[PDB]
Design a protein around this nucleic acid. Structure first.
Lengths: 97, 95
DNA sequence: TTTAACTTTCGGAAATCAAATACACTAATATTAAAACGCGGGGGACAGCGCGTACGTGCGTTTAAGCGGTGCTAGAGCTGTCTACGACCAATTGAGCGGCCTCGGCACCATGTGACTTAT
DNA sequence: ATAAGTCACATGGTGCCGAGGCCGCTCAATTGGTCGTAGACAGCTCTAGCACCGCTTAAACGCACGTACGCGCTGTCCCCCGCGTTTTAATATTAGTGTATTTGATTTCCGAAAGTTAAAA
């Protein structure tokens, strides 16, 4: 059984583990840290892609595009603080009214 | 030659299947969301281990990651993030 | 008395050497989407102004801010001591896709005995 | 009549052709197990906090009020552009060469590790 399955997560906890090892942040790593980080990343990804899917519903098409993503990220006022520095590829810019 | 490139695209698509089963993803959008998780991973891990160095403690651990996420995320998202991290690690430790 | 630099080594790193792609650019080409010349225009942004206004400008009596004693205790920082917990090794798996096989089924030649027959 | 013999019959079996049925080798990362050490801890003492009074008079707030100041005002200057027009240069096509990268085999490189000791308030 996989670590992601035992956690109930979809994301690769083992990959996050090995990447923490690659990123040389600290020599000793708690075993709970990679799973916690993977859960956080999965939550953030799920939230942003759900917002993008609802934006696609607003645009009346069944495939996510960078415009949907940019609109969602700019409109959500908390994720706009989280990614205030980011500008999206083929994402555009939001209207004045 | 070309080495195999790391990606989370399969997991992103699977969680989109869970959310909206009828919806697909464009290639540019998929690259965008693949970059999302790596960017977040870095800006969490660097801050967390810097905080560990401030503690002058050897181990980066769950408390360090929890503090790092709640530091850097905006608060409204931070509450959800810490709750989900805590419940996920609890579910794991219950194995 | 505690923070270093000698050292004494060594086994992964960071050079080298090489050929395998492969990609950039330096470049012809007719088209052709946008540039940029060219005159009014609205429209607006600034000149000039009255008088209302609003934040300073100016006095009286307050208020807090600042000391200045009077504790006293809550943490600072430090635990001296017991693990746990995770970093390593490896085994302890496994699954997926090639490999042998080996099933049974065909086409083909061998072998014995029942007719019968004949010259025994 | 019958031992020899020919003969056809009947069954034997040997050979080759798929083929569906097990099997063999490898690498993922799990988890099993095990050393050794961060971690929380064990008596602890004293720090700078933070009250807890107990003054003083320096700020400060309101009391008055005053030029300064604002804010639309208002002739009018001006300039931006909405087009209309010629240009005009932006397409976006092929291209091979000319390194650009590049990925093998080392092959030295060098600093983390292990002593040994210099130095150090």
């Amino acid at each position: 059984q996989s670590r992601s399955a035992k956690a109930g997560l979809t994301f690769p906890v083992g990959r996050v583990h090995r990447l923490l090892r690659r990123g040389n942040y600290a020599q000793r790593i708690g075993s709970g840290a990679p799973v916690y980080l993977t859960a956080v990343l999965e939550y953030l990804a799920a939230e942003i892609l759900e917002l993008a899917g609802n934006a696609a519903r607003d645009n009346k098409k069944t495939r996510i595009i960078p415009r949907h993503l940019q609109l969602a990220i700019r409109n959500d006022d908390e994720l706009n603080k989280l990614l205030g520095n980011v500008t999206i590829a083929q994402g555009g810019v939001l209207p004045n009214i | 030659s070309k080495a195999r490139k790391e990606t989370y695209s399969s997991y992103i698509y699977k969680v989109l299947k869970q959310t909206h089963p009828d919806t697909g993803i464009s290639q540019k959008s998929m690259s965008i969301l693949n970059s999302f998780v790596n960017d977040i991973f870095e800006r969490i891990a660097t801050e967390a281990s810097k905080l560990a160095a401030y503690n002058k403690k050897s181990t980066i651990s769950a408390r360090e990651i929890q503090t790092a996420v709640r530091l850097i995320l905006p608060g409204e998202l931070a509450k959800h993030a810490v709750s989900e991290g805590t419940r996920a690690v609890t579910k794991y430790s219950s194995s």
